[PDB]
Structures are given as C-alpha cells and as structure tokens.
Design a protein around this nucleic acid. Structure first.
Ligand SMILES: [Zn+2]
Length: 121
DNA sequence: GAGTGTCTGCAGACACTC
DNA sequence: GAGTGTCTGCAGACACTC
C-alpha cells in the first residue's frame, strides 16, 4: 500500500498465500524502520547490493524470533530469504560480515536484518 | 540442547467525540 | 489537541518433539 513497500517487494527473490505473506513481512519491517530512519539504508543496501551500507536493525526479542502473520522465524533469515536466498533453510547457512556491528550471533539489544551484511555458508 | 508451534493479554493503531 | 473506547497483530509464555 506504501510506495517504498511496493519498491522493495520488486526486489523479492524467487502461490498467492505466500505472495501476501512476503508483503506482510516487508510492511512489518518498513513500519519498524520508519521510526528509526534506517529505511533509506535498507533501500540503498537492497538496490545497490552494497556490503558497506550501515546496519539495518530491529529490536532483539528474548528468543530471537519475529512473528509475521502467524508464522515465527529469525528476522535475519526471513529478510535474507526474501531478498537474497529464497531456498535458505537455517541461520547456520548465514555468516555475518566483520563490518556488521549488530549481527544476529552477537546477541546485542538490536539485530541487523541488512541482507548484505550476511554471507551464505 | 535446538528447534518449532500454539495461545493470549495488551500496546499500538484506529476511530471517534468535545 | 485531549480524552475515550474498540480492534488486532504479535512478544512472551508454554508446551511439546528430536
Ligand atoms: Zn549489520
């Protein structure tokens, strides 16, 4: 419904039930980042595929999971699956870059969901 | 431990009224 | 804006399984 949501969805990697879910996951993150001003960095990382962009963080939940329309999962895996690796299955297949300040494995108060701060293992 | 799924009370989001 | 009430998505809480 938002234009940045429509813009970012065009970058999704690859029936109708999942099309609506992926939109929900995007709208969820966009709502969170509009508050922190890191929405511009996310668009820059997605569109330029630049590893040197800033960290795109969301608050860490106690168990690490993020719920989007009844489904639970680790946000970094969710957003790496969405924009980079649609076939991704685990957080073990992901290794954050050294420059990633808020990597998932660091267990900081904020978690980075910048797909270009993670490398497939 | 490691991972997953279901349930539910309430903060945040709307939707009003003066 | 201030105040109030309804609605609803999800974090936190359990409850399992290997
Ligand atoms: Zn990062």
């Amino acid at each position: 419904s938002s234009p940045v949501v429509k813009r970012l969805l065009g970058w999704k990697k690859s029936n109708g039930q999942e099309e609506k879910w992926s939109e929900k996951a995007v709208k969820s993150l966009v709502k969170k980042l509009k508050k922190t001003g890191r929405l511009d960095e996310l668009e820059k990382a997605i569109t330029t595929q630049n590893m040197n962009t800033k960290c795109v963080t969301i608050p860490r939940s106690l168990d690490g999971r993020l719920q989007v329309s009844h489904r639970k999962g680790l946000p970094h895996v969710i957003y790496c699956r969405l924009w980079r690796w649609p076939d991704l299955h685990s957080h073990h297949e992901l290794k954050a870059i050294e420059n990633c300040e808020y990597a998932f494995n660091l267990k900081k108060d904020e978690v980075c969901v910048n797909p270009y701060h993670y490398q497939r293992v």
